[PDB]
Design a binder for these strands. Structure first.
Ligand SMILES: C[S@@+](CC[C@H](N)C(=O)[O-])C[C@H]1O[C@@H](n2cnc3c(N)ncnc32)[C@H](O)[C@@H]1O
Lengths: 121, 366, 227
RNA sequence: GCCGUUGAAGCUCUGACCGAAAGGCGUGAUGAGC
RNA sequence: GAGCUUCAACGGC
């Protein structure tokens, strides 16, 4: 229930994004880690960014939420950093990840965005 | 023997019997802010004096600095933390203060707190950016004014330029001594100057090629020196404040790399927030803004670090490891900065130990 | 549709809110003051503040069946790590008017949040200080009945022993919430708590060790007795 | 709509491996001009 | 001298 999660996310969704990665990890361009993720956002374009809800110090990803209205990119939350690590192709975890080129998920990446724009309100 | 309180300073013998007690003449929180930190104040000093002419030569306080300052004042003093005094004030407080004792412990307690804490907020990170830019501007001028005073007063006593290379020393000469004939043992040794120094000097003074100076041409070279001495003082006032204000800005950052180096990074970043949002890859190379440009331009070997070079562990270790300890530190700043920006809770001690330990790793593998 | 029942611990109440689920709550000492954004409820005439196990730790402990709870109305307590005062406001409801709390908080921008609150709550003294250097608050405080410590520092075991020699009165208790990774992020948690328990027991008796999941990951809350 | 050769303007260290293993590692491995 | 963010003209499905 952290304080840097600015809204609830459904059983699905949180599951939908998680796979949105796996089809960009091959077909598209992806970057993992909170730094490369942060870069990708100020780098002005990464199409969607993903933030685990289990993180501690819970502030190491706290900047992405403000940063993303700044650069005006959508963000979403998966529940587990580890699920997201193996999702992004790494044996360790990921506090967050950014989608650079959607690849196959282009459509999927797209739809997920608009579901987010409602409940950020 | 002696423990403090919210009312006055108290003295007990080995039986707990109350010897003498001095109520605070000043504002209780103002005396306390001093005494607790370990510094010695009027009512305490005036106290153990009235104690010295009692039959008490023997002293023990609750703080190791109180004891230092007391014996360095001639009084035999020792440190036992909970001691016969504090155990008595903090045990049966009503005996001393009456039944509202807690209420009093309240008025002062919150009073000392609102005195120790900075009000309001909100650009105080941008203020630390002045204090810092200011702080090192006051360096560029102290170096000018000192270059002058040197060239100037060297007309009268040219030799002293190389016998006193330490600027604050040269400057206390001109200020305190004045005319070259005012030189003599007693005053030279009060400058803290050494022995060989006190001996040379005169050997180059007593026979000099310097021009003569009237008490008029001297007083104005003294007003130059006396001014630089005001700038040295303003420097300290800028340091004390960078320190004191990082407590409200980036306690974590301050506890991690030091109040000063942390103000630097806040400075390169443009504010605490701009420093928060930074990928630790950026924070690594902060300050290297020039050597960075010639990376993305001439494709040169990237700077392994910026301002953070100042970190002891990086600059006193072989170049073998500098790069690794570089980002090893950059990472922990990234976090301290984000904690600092968002909550301000103090996690630095975990951050340090995670970093000390990563560093041994880096060392062990090379 | 909420009904408030008394709880085994004095100054702690049980609530069953609309959905039939039980929750824990203290009674608001200063009616009409929101300290952390906590949900407030009204029983017959008076405000009770739901103590959420997710925002608190004393709170998670109590929901997890903490047996020993030395903190009761009238008691004095030295609170190390008091922060904004989220949980401390609760133990200020429990303690009551006839009680005393000494908050000690190392970071000023944070303790500041707590200060204006203590104006109406006359039973907390906010004290800026470093729980490592007990002596440096020596004239601010007085012997207490209990020591609560939530500090997440690597020396917290010792921090508690040091304060305990100074301020914790003989026969009194202390309680400390330990965040595993905070002490060592290399060694295994049940091992950290092993070492913390042995360390603590050189001074105290360790009477209870209560793992804090589901609410916090890898924290446990020890309660110890000073002989 | 996608896409492309572009053009001035502004921004930007790199990013999955080290270990003989044990392990460490995207909470940042590795290389690198403060 | 690379690279991403961006905006007139050009090639094309
Ligand atoms: C209330 S607890 C944890 C709160 C957070 N919501 C978690 O859970 C931590 C507090 O202890 C404070 N603190 C850290 N080290 C301290 C020390 N050595 N002495 C006194 N206070 C300290 C910090 O400022 C921090 O606010």
């Amino acid at each position: 229930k952290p304080s840097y999660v600015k809204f609830e996310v459904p059983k699905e969704l949180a599951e939908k994004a998680l796979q949105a990665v796996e089809i960009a990890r091959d077909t598209g361009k992806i970057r993992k880690g909170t730094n490369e993720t942060t870069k990708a956002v100020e780098r002005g374009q990464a199409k969607l960014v993903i933030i685990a809800e289990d993180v501690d110090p819970e502030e190491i990803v706290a900047h992405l939420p403000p940063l993303c209205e700044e650069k005006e990119i959508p963000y979403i939350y998966v529940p587990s950093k580890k699920e997201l690590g193996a999702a992004a192709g790494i044996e360790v975890a990921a506090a967050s990840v950014a989608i650079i080129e959607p690849g196959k998920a282009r459509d999927l990446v797209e739809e997920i965005a608009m579901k987010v724009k409602e409940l950020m309100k | 023997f002696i423990s403090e309180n919210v009312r006055g300073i108290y003295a007990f013998d080995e039986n707990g019997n109350l010897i003498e007690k001095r109520y605070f003449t000043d504002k209780p929180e103002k005396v306390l802010d001093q005494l607790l930190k370990g510094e010695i104040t009027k009512d305490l000093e005036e106290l153990l004096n009235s104690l010295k002419e009692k039959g008490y030569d023997e002293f023990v306080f609750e703080h190791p600095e109180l004891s230092r300052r007391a014996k360095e004042l001639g009084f035999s003093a020792t440190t036992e933390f909970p001691n016969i005094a504090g155990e008595r004030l903090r045990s049966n407080p009503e005996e001393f203060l009456g039944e509202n004792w807690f209420e009093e412990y309240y008025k002062v307690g919150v009073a000392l707190t609102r005195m120790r804490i900075q009000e309001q907020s909100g650009a105080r990170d941008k203020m630390v950016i002045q204090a810092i830019e200011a702080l090192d501007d006051v360096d560029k001028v102290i170096n000018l004014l000192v270059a002058r005073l040197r060239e100037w007063y060297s007309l009268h006593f040219p030799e002293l330029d190389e016998l006193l290379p330490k600027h604050p020393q040269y400057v206390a000469f001109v200020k305190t001594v004045g005319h070259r004939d005012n030189i003599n043992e007693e005053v030279l040794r009060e400058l803290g100057l050494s022995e060989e120094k006190i001996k040379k000097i005169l050997e180059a003074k007593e026979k000099t090629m310097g021009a003569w100076m009237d008490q008029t041409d001297i007083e104005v070279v003294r007003q130059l020196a006396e001014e630089i001495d005001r700038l040295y003082q303003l420097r300290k006032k800028l340091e004390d404040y960078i320190d004191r204000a990082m407590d409200d800005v980036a306690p974590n950052l301050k506890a991690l790399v030091g109040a000063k180096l942390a103000a630097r990074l806040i400075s390169l970043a443009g504010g605490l927030r701009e420093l928060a949002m930074m990928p630790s890859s950026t924070i690594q190379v902060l300050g290297a803004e020039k050597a960075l440009f010639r990376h993305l331009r001439t494709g040169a070997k990237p700077p392994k670090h910026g301002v953070i070079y100042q970190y002891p562990a990086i600059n006193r270790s072989p170049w073998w490891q500098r790069g690794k300890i570089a980002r090893a530190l950059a990472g922990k700043l990234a976090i301290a900065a984000r904690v600092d920006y968002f909550s301000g809770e103090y996690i630095a001690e975990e951050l340090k130990k995670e970093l000390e330990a990563r560093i041994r790793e880096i060392k062990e593998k090379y | 549709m909420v009904e408030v029942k008394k709880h085994k611990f004095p100054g702690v109440y049980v609530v069953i809110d609309d959905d039939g689920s039980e929750k824990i709550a203290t009674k608001n000492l200063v009616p009409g003051q929101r300290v952390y954004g906590e949900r407030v409820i009204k029983w017959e005439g008076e405000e009770y503040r739901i103590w959420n196990p997710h925002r608190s730790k004393l709170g998670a402990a109590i929901v997890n069946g903490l047996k020993n709870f030395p903190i009761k109305p009238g008691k004095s307590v030295l609170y190390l790590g008091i922060a904004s005062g989220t949980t401390a406001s609760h133990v200020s409801d429990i303690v009551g008017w006839e009680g005393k709390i000494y908050g000690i908080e190392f970071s000023p921008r944070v303790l500041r949040e707590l200060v204006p609150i203590v104006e109406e709550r006359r039973n907390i003294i906010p004290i800026l200080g470093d729980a490592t250097k007990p002596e440096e608050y020596r004239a601010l405080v007085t012997k207490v009945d209990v020591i609560f410590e939530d500090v997440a520092q690597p020396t917290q075991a010792k921090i508690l022993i040091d304060n305990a020699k100074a301020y914790l009165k003989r026969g009194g208790y202390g309680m400390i919430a330990v965040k595993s990774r905070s002490i060592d992020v290399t060694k295994e948690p049940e091992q950290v708590f092993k070492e913390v328990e042995r360390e603590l027991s050189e001074y105290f008796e360790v009477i209870e060790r209560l793992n804090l999941e589901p609410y916090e990951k890898d924290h446990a809350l020890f309660v110890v007795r000073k002989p």
